[PDB]
Design a protein around this ligand. Structure first.
Ligand SMILES: Cc1ccc(C)c(Cn2c([C@@H](O)c3ccncc3)nc3ccccc32)c1
Ligand SMILES: [Cl-]
Lengths: 147, 142, 126
């Protein structure tokens, strides 16, 4: 008998270069037991503890003049407070200095366990989609597992 | 009430398989239960359904010299016969001070009877086996 | 129905777990109430205020009823060099056959670096 636990693993659309579009319709991506992907946001079907997790990968060929600051954030939009509450966040400076030009790879991973309500809208956002790496699949994903 | 019918696996790396990330099930605290097979370094699924899938690898380099470390979990379905990646991480880490990069990949997936999950790296030379529990691969049916 | 625990860190000098089904928490360790398959997991977060070559280790070990052994373990190294802040999480998790009365500890080498949803330890019976 299949599991009744809400789950979801959405992935970046690799053709949507310049955005971070989460897909559920894509091979090895998934929504189940009530979880929805609406408006680039996961929608929690029922209260409980969820494991939330996301990976994003950044890439640049060399370091430019302006300082590069990469951020990744999992936000929450509750029905009783319909403004983004940050759940998880992290920030990486992949460049110490400007190149006087080998390629760099900055992943950002966020995971934790949080209490969610029914109708919670979860988003996972980055500041610089132009540095996202869609070179092969599996690298950029966002997902939840009810515990 | 009784023991669990759920398919599961937790396989561990062989520290003396050179140039290989060789997964093993016959070890203490390792495990293949309820139809999960380890076949050609690939865990094989016995039933359709939702599974958690996870792997840890830990690389270590004594200092730096352009180093890239990749860790990749991938699916082959009976039906499609194509090797698709499920989760993937690329990392550039760089006396000579020793560095450590753990890479933990995990997620929830919808698998089909007879899929062949595999967990791989680009650089086995950089694997660390300092202690036990450092390098591993498994699935857990929900 | 099934044994479960989710314990978290108290926000000095100790990673101490705080607080439920069949599962006790004697002496900073989860105590398995019966034989079977368990999904054991944890996370911890280290933060530095700027960087002694430091290695942050996090380890979940089984104390089987009579020795003590690593189940899951990782080492991070935050600094490549000797005042910018850094954050470094370590993730552990996997599925394990276990005995009634086994103890599961989740430890760190440097409590001094710990930065107290990101610092937990738990189990779930399958
Ligand atoms: C997504 C996923 C799939 C399978 C497993 C076994 C895990 C490991 N896990 C962890 C933590 O180590 C973690 C978190 C985020 N991403 C990677 C690891 N925290 C957990 C809490 C509950 C269950 C498994 C938990 C995580
Ligand atoms: Cl050990």
């Amino acid at each position: 008998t299949p599991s009744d636990k809400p789950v979801a693993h959405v992935v970046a659309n690799p053709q949507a270069e310049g955005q971070l579009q989460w897909l559920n319709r894509r091979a090895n991506a998934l929504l189940a037991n009530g979880v929805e992907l609406r408006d680039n946001q996961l929608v929690v079907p029922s209260e409980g503890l969820y494991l939330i997790y996301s990976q994003v990968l950044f890439k640049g060929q060399g370091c430019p003049s302006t300082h590069v600051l990469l951020t990744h954030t999992i936000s929450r939009i509750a029905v009783s407070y319909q403004t983004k509450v940050n759940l998880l966040s992290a920030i990486k400076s992949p460049c110490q200095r400007e190149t006087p030009a080998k390629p760099w790879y900055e992943p950002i991973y966020l995971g934790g366990v949080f209490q969610l309500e029914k109708g919670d809208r979860l988003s996972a956002e980055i500041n610089r989609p132009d540095y996202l790496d869609f070179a092969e699949s599996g690298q950029v994903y966002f997902g939840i597992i009810a515990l």
